[PDB]
Design an enzyme around this catalytic site. Structure first.
Site, PDB file in Angstrom:
ATOM      1  N   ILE A   9     -13.567  13.932  18.231  1.00 12.52           N
ATOM      2  CA  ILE A   9     -12.666  15.079  18.120  1.00 12.52           C
ATOM      3  C   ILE A   9     -13.193  16.205  17.197  1.00 12.52           C
ATOM      4  CG2 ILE A   9     -10.514  13.877  18.841  1.00 12.52           C
ATOM      5  CD1 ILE A   9     -10.518  14.628  15.340  1.00 12.52           C
ATOM      6  N   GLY A  10     -14.344  15.999  16.551  1.00 17.17           N
ATOM      7  CA  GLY A  10     -14.913  16.994  15.646  1.00 17.17           C
ATOM      8  C   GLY A  10     -16.062  16.540  14.765  1.00 17.17           C
ATOM      9  N   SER A  11     -16.357  17.343  13.712  1.00 11.38           N
ATOM     10  CA  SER A  11     -17.458  17.115  12.769  1.00 11.38           C
ATOM     11  C   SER A  11     -17.135  17.607  11.357  1.00 11.38           C
ATOM     12  CB  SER A  11     -18.726  17.804  13.269  1.00 11.38           C
ATOM     13  OG  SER A  11     -18.491  19.191  13.465  1.00 11.38           O
ATOM     14  N   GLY A  12     -17.713  16.940  10.351  1.00 15.93           N
ATOM     15  CA  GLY A  12     -17.520  17.270   8.944  1.00 15.93           C
ATOM     16  C   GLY A  12     -18.812  17.356   8.161  1.00 15.93           C
TER      17      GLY A  12
ATOM     18  N   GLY B 183     -21.763  13.748   9.580  1.00 16.17           N
ATOM     19  CA  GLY B 183     -21.187  12.767  10.493  1.00 16.17           C
ATOM     20  C   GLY B 183     -20.115  13.326  11.410  1.00 16.17           C
TER      21      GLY B 183
ATOM     22  N   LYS C 167     -14.760   8.316  10.751  1.00 10.08           N
ATOM     23  CA  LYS C 167     -15.998   9.062  10.548  1.00 10.08           C
ATOM     24  C   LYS C 167     -17.145   8.078  10.720  1.00 10.08           C
ATOM     25  CE  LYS C 167     -18.018  12.559   7.473  1.00 10.08           C
ATOM     26  NZ  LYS C 167     -17.679  13.426   6.315  1.00 10.08           N
TER      27      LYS C 167
ATOM     28  N   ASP D 270     -17.190  23.246  -1.963  1.00  6.41           N
ATOM     29  CA  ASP D 270     -17.050  23.826  -0.632  1.00  6.41           C
ATOM     30  C   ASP D 270     -15.580  24.099  -0.294  1.00  6.41           C
ATOM     31  OD1 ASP D 270     -18.078  25.156   1.540  1.00  6.41           O
ATOM     32  OD2 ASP D 270     -18.473  23.348   2.732  1.00  6.41           O
TER      33      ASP D 270
END
Ligand code: 1QG
Length: 283
Positions: A13-16, A17, A34, A118
């Site tokens: 469903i996404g990225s952050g 890994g 993750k 960040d």
């Protein structure tokens, strides 16, 4: 699809890994997973942060097949997703409800001897259901210890350093190559709040040959944009906040209470209620 005996791996469903959906089969609850083919470094930070308001709970950490796995409680959309869904316009009430919680999340990470490094809309996620009024902070991938856990001895002052966050929200000292400290996470938050107010920042969308040329153009635009010009047409508190952050010394402990009180006094002057009815709740 088995992860640590009780979790079932779902779709990416996404990225952050990369981030996948999943299910805690035993408890009958959806989770976020993750996968990493740094995960261990980051899991230790989340573990240390556990119990804090708006800190996501880590359900499980281990390894499965070709991957290192971290299982987190499922949270809601990011402030960047919500800002885009709201046509990149947030009312003053929403910005102030968010500022109150965001200052508190940052203070909590600092109380645990880390700086985030960040601070951006993508790293704050709203909770789901009963926790839908709560702003959570995520991603400790760029986080660093700023003081010794025992002695509280602050890391030394260092120059000639690389930009270790998003250029758009970086503090002026980060552009100068100075080691990041507590003041830098708070200054980045100040730019995030002005970004929510304006829909864009003046140093956003600058054209350049290389990414390092773009960072140097962002630095120049930030350093030549007075705080009073950046904040023109918005309550003075946003400028007062940024000026206070810019005045902080490298090893200074910020006065978080003063910063929250600045926005809370403006919130009361405006006649708003702390009912956690954000702009997206009206849709
Ligand atoms: C960039 N990023 C987002 C998440 C994340 C965390 C929780 N819930 C979600 C929900 C948000 O609503 C849509 C469905 N996924 C995403 C994560 C993460 C971080 C660590 C981890 F162990 C699992 C996930 N990173």
């Amino acid at each position: 699809l088995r992860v640590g005996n009780r979790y079932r791996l779902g779709r990416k469903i996404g990225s952050g890994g990369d981030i996948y959906l999943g299910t805690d089969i035993a408890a009958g609850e959806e989770v976020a997973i993750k996968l990493e083919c740094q995960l261990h470094i980051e899991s230790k930070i989340y573990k240390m942060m556990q119990g804090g308001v708006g800190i996501p709970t880590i359900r499980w950490c281990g390894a499965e097949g070709d991957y290192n796995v971290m299982v987190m409680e499922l949270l809601g959309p990011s402030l960047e997703d919500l800002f885009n869904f709201c046509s990149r316009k947030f009312s003053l009430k929403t910005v102030l409800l968010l500022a109150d919680q965001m200052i508190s999340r940052i203070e909590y990470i600092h109380s645990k001897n880390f700086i985030h490094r960040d601070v951006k809309p993508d790293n704050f996620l709203m909770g789901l259901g009963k926790k839908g009024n709560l702003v959570y902070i995520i991603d400790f991938g760029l986080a660093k210890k700023y003081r010794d856990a025992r002695t509280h001895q602050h890391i030394p002052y260092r120059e000639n350093k690389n930009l270790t966050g998003t250029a758009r929200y970086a503090s002026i000292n980060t552009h100068l190559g100075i080691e990041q400290s507590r003041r830098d996470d708070l200054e980045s938050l100040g730019y995030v709040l002005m970004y929510f107010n304006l829909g864009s920042l003046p140093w956003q969308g600058l054209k350049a040959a290389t990414k390092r040329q773009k960072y140097e153009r962002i630095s120049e635009k930030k350093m030549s944009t007075p705080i009073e010009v950046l904040c023109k047409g918005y309550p003075s508190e946003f400028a007062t906040y940024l000026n206070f952050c810019r005045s902080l010394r490298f090893d200074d402990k910020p006065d978080y209470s003063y910063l929250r009180q600045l926005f809370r006094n403006l919130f009361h002057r405006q006649g708003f209620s702390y009912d956690y009815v954000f702009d997206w709740n009206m849709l």
